Design a protein that fits this description.
This protein has 13 helices and six strands. It is of the alpha/beta class and 284 residues long. The chain has one domain: Phenylalanine Hydroxylase (Orthogonal Bundle). It is an enzyme of class 1 (oxidoreductase).
């Protein structure tokens, strides 16, 4: 709009009217009075649809975590109550945030075993991986995996490294690492390829596509390749990275990343659909 810019408000803005958030850490008390009977039914529908698709697809740790933490199947979970179990089982807790938050705020939470969860739920007509993460993507997609202590330690170390990053170019590199592991990672298991990425596990379409399709590349995890690989947000992934164990992912954070950012700082990144000379790729 020329000069008098009227725009479509995003869902984050509409849902948070009248609500405040901490100026420093972006947290707020979860607004339980804001979920309508309709939102509880949307949660229940999403949860049930994913639980029929996950067998043979989600890694075993994810399934066990959903069982052990008893994530509510029938309504949006009460964060405080879930935290009673999550803290005792893993040392982590979730904190409510309004929607997207600055990277530095996000790293500081992970570094301190706090996983930020957008509190609001998508509306009825927006059932598959919309614009902006919501409570189902954030809570259902990430929280169960924290039950694996190695994956929880990976996230804590990932956060600590983000807190420390200063080199220009470090942020896009860390964003690609997070996207191709925590959001869209696959893991090879004795029983076949399985999924551990939150952006996949909370999405009906991604859950099916990542293990069924011939078009995408499935490449073995390689830290430096991933930090130098672009990703697209509004379409199915063109490459998925596969780990062999959560220990391999954790061990990847062992080195201090400072020298790695400098090494990649002037590199042209790989396209999201490219295959690099040093990749090991899934056979067929």
């Amino acid at each position: 709009n020329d000069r008098a810019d009227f725009v479509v408000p995003d869902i984050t803005t509409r849902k948070n009217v009248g609500l405040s958030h901490d100026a420093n850490d972006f947290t707020l008390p979860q607004p339980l009075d804001r979920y309508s009977a309709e939102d509880h039914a949307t949660w229940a529908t999403l949860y049930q649809r994913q639980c029929k698709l996950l067998p043979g697809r989600a890694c075993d740790e994810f399934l066990e975590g959903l069982e052990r933490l008893e994530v509510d199947a029938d309504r949006v979970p009460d964060f405080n109550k879930l935290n009673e179990k999550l803290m005792a089982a893993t040392g982590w807790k979730i904190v409510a945030v309004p929607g997207l938050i600055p990277d530095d705020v996000f790293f500081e939470h992970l570094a301190n075993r706090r996983f930020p969860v957008t509190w609001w739920l998508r509306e009825p007509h927006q059932l598959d991986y919309l614009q902006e993460p919501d409570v189902f993507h954030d809570l259902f997609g990430h929280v169960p995996l924290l039950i694996n202590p190695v994956f929880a330690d990976y996230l804590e170390a990932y956060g600590k490294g983000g807190v420390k990053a200063k080199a220009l170019g470090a942020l896009p590199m860390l964003a690609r690492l997070y996207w191709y592991t925590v959001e869209f990672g696959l893991i090879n298991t004795p029983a076949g390829m399985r999924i551990y990425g939150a952006g996949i596990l909370s999405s009906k379409s991604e859950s099916i596509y990542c293990l069924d399709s011939a078009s995408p590349n499935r490449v073995g995890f390689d830290l430096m390749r991933i930090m130098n690989t672009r990703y697209r947000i509004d379409t199915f992934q063109k490459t998925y990275f596969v780990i062999d164990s959560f220990k391999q992912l954790f061990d990847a954070t062992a080195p201090d990343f400072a020298p790695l950012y400098l090494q990649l700082a002037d590199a042209q990144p790989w396209g999201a659909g490219d295959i690099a000379p040093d990749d090991l790729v899934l056979n067929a």
